[PDB]
Ligand binder design. Structure first.
Ligand SMILES: CC(C)[C@@H](NS(=O)(=O)c1ccc2c(Cl)cnc(NC(=N)N)c2c1)C(=O)N1CCOCC1
Length: 236
């Protein structure tokens, strides 16, 4: 997250840190709890990942430094990547992780609702991107989970900024005209969460962008509402 601020304990209880454990243990991607055994994340996170054996999902984490040899985590039973996924920039950047056991909900770990049936025309004005990602192109994973409020931009404006890519109705973009606040490397797969009528909804999944927080180069996210049928089919 570029231009973000430190989050506090229990602030984003759906946010998870997905770690890889080979050849070293490190934060690979963000993700969101959407059910008792389900994490919604980005397909691009799994590039070169041999199998789910090397993955660990840590929930209720604020600082990456909290993760020690005795920190509880969930094993990953299955990785379900959308069958049309090719590369983040081309879309379908969505994946589900089925956990080896169920998540017991607490103040520190809770699911986030998907955009609701009947809310297709809602104009979201309170959207936040969170993650342990870079604060600039050449940086490192951050210790404390960062947050930044970002305004959504129309698909029409987004397409004008990315004339080399196909910005489809299955993507949603967000960014300030002058840049400054945005997602970056390491925020991949995490949520773009929007609060509407005091209820948080998982509107986007962090996917890609040209640079980080660059002027007129908004972040591009998987448009979750367009995958609700796919999510429901895979989770049932
Ligand atoms: C367009 C690619 C050359 C590449 N661009 S990048 O500058 O290296 C970069 C890297 C990661 C980013 C993530 Cl995860 C989120 N948001 C960004 N930018 C933004 N919100 N403005 C990211 C910018 C990029 O996005 N990815 C991510 C998807 O897998 C391929 C590499």
């Amino acid at each position: 997250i570029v231009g973000g601020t430190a989050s506090v304990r229990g602030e984003w209880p759906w946010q998870v840190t997905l770690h890889t454990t080979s050849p070293t243990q490190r934060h690979l991607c963000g993700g969101s709890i959407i059910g008792n055994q389900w994490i919604l994340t980005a397909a691009h996170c799994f590039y070169g990942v041999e199998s789910p054996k090397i993955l660990r999902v840590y929930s209720g984490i604020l600082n990456q430094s909290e993760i020690k040899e005795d920190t509880s985590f969930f094993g990953v039973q299955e990785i379900i990547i959308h069958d049309q996924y090719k590369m983040a920039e081309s879309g379908y950047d969505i994946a589900l992780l089925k956990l080896e056991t169920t998540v017991n909900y607490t103040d520190s770990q809770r699911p986030i609702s998907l955009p609701s049936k009947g809310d297709r025309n809602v104009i979201y004005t309170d959207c936040w991107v969170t993650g342990w990602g870079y604060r600039k192109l050449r940086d490192k994973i951050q210790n404390t989970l960062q947050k930044a409020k970002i305004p959504l931009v129309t698909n029409e404006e987004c397409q004008k900024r990315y004339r080399g890519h196909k910005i489809t109705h299955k993507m949603i973009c967000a960014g300030y005209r002058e840049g400054g606040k945005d997602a970056c490397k390491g925020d991949s797969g995490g949520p773009l969460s929007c609060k509407h009528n005091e209820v948080w909804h998982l509107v986007g999944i962090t996917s890609w962008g040209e640079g980080c927080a660059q002027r007129e180069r908004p972040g591009v996210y998987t448009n979750v509402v367009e995958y609700v049928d796919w999510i429901l089919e895979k989770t049932q």
